[PDB]
């Protein structure tokens, strides 16, 4: 993101300051208090002016925070773990 942020900052010609969210959360809606925390809450409450991070474009975040066009497309994938013995010619019959 920092090199991506540099290009965005260079294109718009503005100085940028890099910081880290204190709680280290991408942000989610809370039913009990209806208070947003983490990445999502930083932009809403004015603690941040722009977010450049792997933030998934979802309905909940879109309807409050303006989302630019997706710069990177992804999806759910699958992860799996990717020499015969010297006397392997005796395998067909038992010892």
């Amino acid at each position: 993101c920092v090199d991506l942020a540099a290009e965005i900052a260079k294109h718009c010609g503005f100085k940028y300051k890099l910081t880290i969210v204190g709680d280290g959360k991408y942000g989610a809606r809370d039913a009990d208090t209806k208070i947003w925390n983490g990445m999502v809450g930083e932009l809403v409450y004015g603690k941040a002016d722009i977010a450049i991070a792997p933030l998934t474009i979802t309905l909940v975040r879109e309807e409050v925070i303006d989302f630019s066009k997706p710069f990177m497309s992804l999806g759910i994938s699958i992860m799996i773990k990717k020499k015969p013995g010297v006397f392997s010619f005796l395998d067909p019959l038992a010892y």
């Binding site: 090199d3 991506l4 290009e7 965005i8 294109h11 718009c12 990445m39 932009l43 809403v44 004015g46 941040a48 002016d49 722009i50 977010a51 450049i52 991070a53 792997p54 933030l55 998934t56 474009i57 979802t58 975040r61 409050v64 925070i65 303006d66 989302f67 630019s68 066009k69 997706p70 710069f71 990177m72 497309s73 992804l74 999806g75 759910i76 994938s77 699958i78 992860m79 799996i80 773990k81 990717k82 020499k83 015969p84 013995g85 010297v86 006397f87 392997s88 010619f89 005796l90 395998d91 067909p92 019959l93």
Partner: protein, 243 residues
């Protein structure tokens, strides 16, 4: 006793013999040994053919549906996140049955954190499969010791975009810049650079399958040579002392 063992060995190896039994009992022994040899050799050939055919028929899992049908290799998602929620809401026949497996599965294939899930994949020796996003999947694929591999296509479609508070002056200029970078190739080039430039990573029978028979053959040749020289030395030293 020496010639009998030679005849039995030649009969088992289904090779020619200079001699054959002529008595009734000798021929009975020869006949039963021949039947035993025929059955055993045919059994060896048939079982080897079955082994090789079954190995050739093994198709590695590539996409979701072929993996979904089989149950030998376990799989599961994170204990939380949108990955689980996507499976519940999905009504695709490939995906509706996808949720149905870990719901009734012991032990729980859910993982508390991504790092532990990746770590348990390495020790699983291919027994377990992990389902995460595509972008970071290639990164762990490019991480050491390079034992995991992403296979197949993306199950669903998502995206990452720049987040801007509503009604901000940075809304449209960033969106134009995001499109500009993608169409300029800088964004694409930067994507390719970090994943790969910073990365840290048949049908015929091979000689390894039959190396043992070669080793045994050469060991037998060496043993026969050693026996020949030993007997020659013994015979020479026997006659020299006599003379």
């Amino acid at each position: 006793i020496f010639n009998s063992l030679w005849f039995s060995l030649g009969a088992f190896m289904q090779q020619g013999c200079d001699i054959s039994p002529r008595s009734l009992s000798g021929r009975i022994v020869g006949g039963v040994w021949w039947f035993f040899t025929l059955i055993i050799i045919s059994s060896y050939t048939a079982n080897l053919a079955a082994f090789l055919t079954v190995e050739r028929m093994v198709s590695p899992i590539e996409s979701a549906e072929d993996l979904s049908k089989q149950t030998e290799i376990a799989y599961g998602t994170l204990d939380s996140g949108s990955t689980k929620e996507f499976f519940r809401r999905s009504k695709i026949a490939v995906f509706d049955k996808m949720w149905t497996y870990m719901r009734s599965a012991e032990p729980s294939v859910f993982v508390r954190t991504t790092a532990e899930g990746v770590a348990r994949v390495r020790k699983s020796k291919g027994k377990y499969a992990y389902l995460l996003e595509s972008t970071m999947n290639e990164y762990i694929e490019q991480r050491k010791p390079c034992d995991t591999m992403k296979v197949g296509g993306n199950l669903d479609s998502k995206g990452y975009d720049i987040a801007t508070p509503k009604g901000s002056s940075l809304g449209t200029p960033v969106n134009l810049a995001v499109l500009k970078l993608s169409e300029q190739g800088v964004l694409d080039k930067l994507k390719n650079k970090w994943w790969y430039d910073k990365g840290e990573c048949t049908s015929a029978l091979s000689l390894s399958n039959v190396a043992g028979v070669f080793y045994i053959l050469v060991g037998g040749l060496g043993l026969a040579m050693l026996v020949a020289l030993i007997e020659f030395c013994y015979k020479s030293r026997a006659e020299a002392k006599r003379m």
